[PDB]
Design a protein around this ligand. Structure first.
Ligand SMILES: O=C(Nc1ccc(OC(F)(F)F)cc1)N(Cc1cccc(-c2nccs2)c1)C1CC1
Ligand SMILES: [Cl-]
Length: 280
């Protein structure tokens, strides 16, 4: 079922970044539809790549980054994805925040912070991707803005760099890299990962969106953040966050996993708020 792509049809442009087990390149792909694509090159490694390819071929949704296939005939092994021009959502939020004008290039279009409508549109799209994954009983385990991508026209989709571990500071070593600031108490304490720990992570993503990409618990060390989370401390309402949006975050952050609101209900509430603000 996995689509295969000839090595001749992939023209590497430049290396975007690299991690311990992979390198990501911007490339052009021929006879796929010239087309820009993001290519992951693998540094057992195989079989894990094969399971990954099968999984990415089955995950198909408007808010999941598009996977086009693999290149296995030759070395290294390649995975081909659509190119998301505006990069990862954490960097996107940080570059479209209150200090956007200071950071902007001279030619940037209408520099300034994203407005409420745009922030709800980002939030609703991430929630839609999570509704799809929950429907498949798929647990992401690392939902965070660094793992979402932004395309032209404020199109937001869920991904997973794997190599996120630029963002090494967002993970804590115990003893495996865990994104503790995005995790609920049961995941930090017992590594219990479920659709309910993903909804908790979505509440944290909502907080990152409304703080224009700040790191959750930024004032705290990893050990201090683990202690705050397990003690039940809640992140502060962001200045740009309306009370209705903070109530949605609180619904994702109920201590008992079974008490957390479903991602379908969270998505429905964000869509309703986005609809109510469209003309205002
Ligand atoms: O996000 C991924 N991979 C990935 C996707 C989906 C997925 O399914 C799940 F459900 F978990 F979401 C799992 C893993 N990337 C990053 C990625 C992809 C596409 C474009 C871009 C860029 N375009 C511009 C600057 S960077 C980057 C791969 C490492 C390549
Ligand atoms: Cl509330």
């Amino acid at each position: 079922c996995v689509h295969h792509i000839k090595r001749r049809d992939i023209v590497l442009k430049w290396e975007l970044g690299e991690g311990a087990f992979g390198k990501v390149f911007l490339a052009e792909c021929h006879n796929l539809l010239k087309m820009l694509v993001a290519v992951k090159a693998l540094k057992s490694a195989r079989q894990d790549f094969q399971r990954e390819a099968e999984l990415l071929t089955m995950l198909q949704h408007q808010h999941i980054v598009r996977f086009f296939g693999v290149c296995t005939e030759g070395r290294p092994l390649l995975m081909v994805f659509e190119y998301m021009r505006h990069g990862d959502l954490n960097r996107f939020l940080r570059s479209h925040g209150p200090d956007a004008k200071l950071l902007a290039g001279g030619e940037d279009v209408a520099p300034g912070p994203l407005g409420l409508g745009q922030l709800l549109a980002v939030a609703s799209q991430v929630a839609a991707g999570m509704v799809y994954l929950a429907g498949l009983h798929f647990v992401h385990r690392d939902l965070a803005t660094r793992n979402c991508l932004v395309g032209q026209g404020l199109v937001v989709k869920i991904g997973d760099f794997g190599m996120s571990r630029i963002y090494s500071t967002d993970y804590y070593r115990v003893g495996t890299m865990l994104p503790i600031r995005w995790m609920p108490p049961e995941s930090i304490l017992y590594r219990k990962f479920t659709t309910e720990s993903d909804v908790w992570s979505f509440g944290v993503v909502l907080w990152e969106i409304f703080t224009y990409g700040k790191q959750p618990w930024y004032q705290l060390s990893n050990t201090e953040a683990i202690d705050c989370i397990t003690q039940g401390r809640e992140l502060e309402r962001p200045r740009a966050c309306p009370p209705e949006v903070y109530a949605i975050m609180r619904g994702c952050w109920q201590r008992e996993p079974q008490q957390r609101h479903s991602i379908k209900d969270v998505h429905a509430r964000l869509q309703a708020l986005a609809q109510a603000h469209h003309h205002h």
